[PDB]
Amino acid sequence: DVNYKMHFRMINEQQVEDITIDFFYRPHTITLLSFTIVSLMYFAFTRDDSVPEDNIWRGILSVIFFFLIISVLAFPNGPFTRPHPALWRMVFGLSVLYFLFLVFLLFLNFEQVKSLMYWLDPNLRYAERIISHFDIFAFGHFWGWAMKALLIRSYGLCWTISITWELTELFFMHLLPNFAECWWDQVILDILLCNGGGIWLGMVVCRFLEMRTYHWASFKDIHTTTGKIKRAVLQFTPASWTYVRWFDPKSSFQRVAGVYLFMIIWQLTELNTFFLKHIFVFQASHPLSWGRILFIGGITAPTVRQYYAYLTDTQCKRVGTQCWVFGVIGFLEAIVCIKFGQDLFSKTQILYVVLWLLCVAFTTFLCLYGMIWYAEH
Amino acid sequence: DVNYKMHFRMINEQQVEDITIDFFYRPHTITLLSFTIVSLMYFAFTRDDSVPEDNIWRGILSVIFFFLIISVLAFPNGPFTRPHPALWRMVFGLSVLYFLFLVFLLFLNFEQVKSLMYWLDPNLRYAERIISHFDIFAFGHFWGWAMKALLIRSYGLCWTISITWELTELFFMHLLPNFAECWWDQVILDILLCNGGGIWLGMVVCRFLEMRTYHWASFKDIHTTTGKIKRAVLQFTPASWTYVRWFDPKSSFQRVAGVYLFMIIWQLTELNTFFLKHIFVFQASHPLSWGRILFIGGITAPTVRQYYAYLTDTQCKRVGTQCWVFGVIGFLEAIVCIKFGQDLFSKTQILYVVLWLLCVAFTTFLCLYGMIWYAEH
Ligand SMILES: CCCCCCCC/C=C/CCCCCCCC(=O)O[C@H](COC(=O)CCCCCCCCCCCCCCC)COP(=O)([O-])OCC[N+](C)(C)C
Ligand SMILES: CCCCCCCC/C=C/CCCCCCCC(=O)O[C@H](COC(=O)CCCCCCCCCCCCCCC)COP(=O)([O-])OCC[N+](C)(C)C
Ligand SMILES: CCCCCCCC/C=C/CCCCCCCC(=O)O[C@H](COC(=O)CCCCCCCCCCCCCCC)COP(=O)([O-])OCC[N+](C)(C)C
Ligand SMILES: CCCCCC(=O)OC[C@H](COP(=O)(O)OC[C@H](N)C(=O)O)OC(=O)CCCCC
Ligand SMILES: CCCCCC(=O)OC[C@H](COP(=O)(O)OC[C@H](N)C(=O)O)OC(=O)CCCCC
Ligand SMILES: CCCCCC(=O)OC[C@H](COP(=O)(O)OC[C@H](N)C(=O)O)OC(=O)CCCCC
Ligand SMILES: CCCCCC(=O)OC[C@H](COP(=O)(O)OC[C@H](N)C(=O)O)OC(=O)CCCCC
Ligand SMILES: CCCCCCCCCCCCCC
Ligand SMILES: CCCCCCCCCCCCCC
């Protein structure tokens, strides 16, 4: 009750501790009101509004910007408080915008969605060997895996997800057999080098952060210029690292089911990315692909932390709002891919779709024994 | 600091006191997660999306519906906690929807706004004596004035703004001289009966509610059926009524200028209503006209109590988020009228627009002496 609302406030709206420069946190919401009104007056009395399409585009951009401002004013900032809670409020505002956009798309038919996508960018309408495969997107995949390893902190989770998803991508070759590819490309380059290296780097960084002691001093008290610069740059780094062990030695059935649902939703997000790219046929270099991946990772970090907090802490009896929104976003992307994807499906074998559900369950069951037996030894 | 955040929480997120039926307040945000996903699955796989135009309409309704659900989870509930804080989160969720809508319109040109309005309702494109003037809108205008009187509790405000607006509504006859009307339409029917009668009814309600003692008991503890029914209907009535006195006997210049801004923004909302009807031609009977007045009426109730809290209590050092949004909405509607209204502007004398600014200042200055001198006697 009294603790419940406080325990949930530690998941939704984490407060900033040890505020030295009070200027950075004192609200000035009336100044924000004046700024918004004056900006709208300028953009309404000086802008040129003779072109319809550009008017619609700029209106959409302005609506997004001022929804971000409203999110700063009202929305919660998750379990994170660096560099500033306003940033995570803005990320939550983007999450809500995306969730509503996905809600809208479920009512338009395929022709209307295609027309909207062509409106977003008209160019869509027209649309040894080891060394060559490395690219910027391999860099992105590796760094995303590193961030996931940082946030999850379990080899038996990240590796299970990596192997399962790589095998699913290999199995879904029949959807797009035109492209010239081999199993080795999506086995070695991904499981061994990209995903493996990302997981290793993330794990070593998490190990460092867990045993690092945090001695955040006031930016004002520091005297030397190099010290001030170091304090400024180190702010973007986390101020603390929670001790994340998913599997208790005496874990109950509820905890195992929670971790299983976590892994299932992770694979669902990977599947949503794959099938969105497949159905709406934009290249990986297109902003609608890598921008969405970046946004999903930025959502994923606080969502992972909130899901861990809800699953472990027995005092927390409400799931955080960002984790809720991420769950809705993942499931709505799955529904969108289902609804708009019946054209490419011919003789769907869900027998493989059932297959990793047991294979994840078998592996998350060996994770228990692999630790329960190791706990004895 | 510690009190500041606590005191602002009393304006933004008022908590429910003496919770007896805990069922009505226990969150079930995972059940709300399963409800939306299952709801969209039904509307995505069973609905017929062959009509391009009706898909956009139902999509807009769905986005609005699922922004209320997000607003229930995240947005604050103002200074009000009856009949349930969720309702006042949905009412806030409409304010953010409406405020962002006005941000969009400030970039569209007059042809697109008209084209958008005809889309909402295609019928817009084509578009003794005392007893006869009474109508349903006189009922609304009276009850709107009665509702305001509850939240203000001062004759020297509700009458100053009633008198000075009715003369400003009457002075604007030159803008629309086609309609056959006389000065006595807005002199006896409104100033004396509609507005004057509404204020009197509103004031006697406050006189009752302020000296009424509140003895809210458990709904379960009540035994008789008539008592249970009486308790249920009585929930929609307020649980408490704060003693509001705008003018302190020793009021400072910051307080007088605080009330002066309240009087000015009140006219602006009255001025916005008159103009956007005149600019975008639609009659009062249209749902685009009376629908907006009902929404602004519901928005006004928490905004007045948040503005009063900010004005008086020296501990409150942040204006509530609902009072912030209503300030932006009341101004964006004025910018919208200015940008799209230059066609009717021919030889505008802002001399009368300056005129009530002094006339309100003179009357809000006599309100001081009218109370300061009465305080001595
Ligand atoms: C057609 C296809 C065919 C194949 C289909 C295959 C189907 C396969 C089968 C799948 C079935 C799996 C069933 C698992 C049930 C778990 C129940 C359980 O343990 O309860 C709880 C956990 O579970 C929860 O409820 C947690 C919150 C979830 C809600 C937010 C969603 C956001 C997700 C985003 C997640 C993040 C993802 C990040 C991504 C990187 C724990 O019990 P509790 O007592 O509530 O917890 C105690 C804690 N308190 C309450 C005391 C504080
Ligand atoms: C230029 C723009 C305006 C400038 C002034 C600004 C004022 C802004 C306005 C504010 C008032 C909001 C009400 C708008 C009036 C509705 C339009 C109308 O007359 O059409 C009726 C809708 O009848 C219904 O069935 C209503 C369904 C639920 C309500 C949805 C309304 C939109 C969101 C409101 C929810 C609250 C959100 C915030 C509230 C502020 C009848 O039409 P229909 O039977 O649907 O006929 C089908 C034709 N189409 C439309 C499908 C093609
Ligand atoms: C071209 C046309 C020509 C004609 C133009 C005519 C121009 C006419 C000229 C107008 C000039 C009037 C200027 C007066 C400024 C005085 C300010 C003042 O005293 O500060 C504060 C009040 O003022 C505020 O700042 C309050 C919050 C306002 C922001 C939210 C707006 C929402 C409105 C929604 C209104 C709802 C309406 C509902 C209606 C039914 C008080 O001082 P403070 O020290 O901050 O307060 C102490 C308390 N704390 C801080 C210690 C806690
Ligand atoms: C660009 C700024 C450079 C860095 C300037 C700098 O010194 O930042 C310090 C401030 C916070 O200063 P404190 O050390 O009191 O808060 C810290 C808190 N008590 C804790 O340790 O948790 O950072 C921000 O607000 C965010 C700034 C960035 C806004 C995007
Ligand atoms: C401009 C943005 C710069 C990037 C800002 C940045 O990295 O800081 C975000 C958080 C900071 O975490 P806190 O210090 O608030 O607490 C942490 C919390 N108590 C915990 O338990 O971990 O770190 C991550 O999530 C790092 C993962 C990658 C995130 C992308
Ligand atoms: C339809 C319900 C009929 C009325 C049924 C009824 O008995 O309501 C009681 C509940 C709350 O009951 P309490 O007296 O414990 O809370 C009140 C608090 N202790 C106080 O006094 O402030 O009211 C609602 O949630 C109303 C939601 C209505 C749905 C919006
Ligand atoms: C379905 C909706 C039914 C209508 C519900 C209704 O009337 O309740 C809303 C509030 C109730 O106020 P509280 O009891 O939360 O506290 C009051 C606060 N502490 C104070 O200081 O006043 O009353 C008004 O604003 C009445 C004005 C008219 C509002 C339209
Ligand atoms: C949480 C962070 C969200 C970041 C969103 C990234 C989207 C960027 C899109 C850029 C498009 C550029 C086209 C030229
Ligand atoms: C705060 C309460 C908001 C209520 C909004 C009222 C809008 C109703 C519009 C109904 C249109 C009906 C057209 C047939």
Author numbering:
A (entry chain A), B (entry chain B): 14 to 140, 159 to 408
Please quote the authors directly:
In mammals, PS is synthesized de novo by two endoplasmic reticulum (ER) transmembrane enzymes, phosphatidylserine synthase 1 (PSS1) and phosphatidylserine synthase 2 (PSS2). PSS1 adopts a homodimeric assembly with dimensions of ~100 × 75 × 50 Å. The structure can be categorized into three functional domains: (1) the scaffold domain (TMs 1–3 and 9), which interacts extensively with its counterpart in the opposing protomer to form the dimer interface; (2) the core domain (TMs 4–8 and 10), which constitutes the catalytic center of both protomers, positioned ~65 Å apart and oriented toward the ER lumen; and (3) the PS-binding domain, comprising PH4 and adjacent loops, which create a membrane-parallel platform that accommodates two PS molecules.
This suggests that PC binds to the catalytic center independently of l-serine or Ca2+. The imidazole side chain of H172 directly interacts with the phosphoester group of PC1 at a distance of 2.9 Å. These interactions are not observed in the PSS1apo structure when Ca2+ is absent, because of the less well-resolved local densities for the headgroup of PC1 and the sidechain of H172, despite the similar overall map quality.
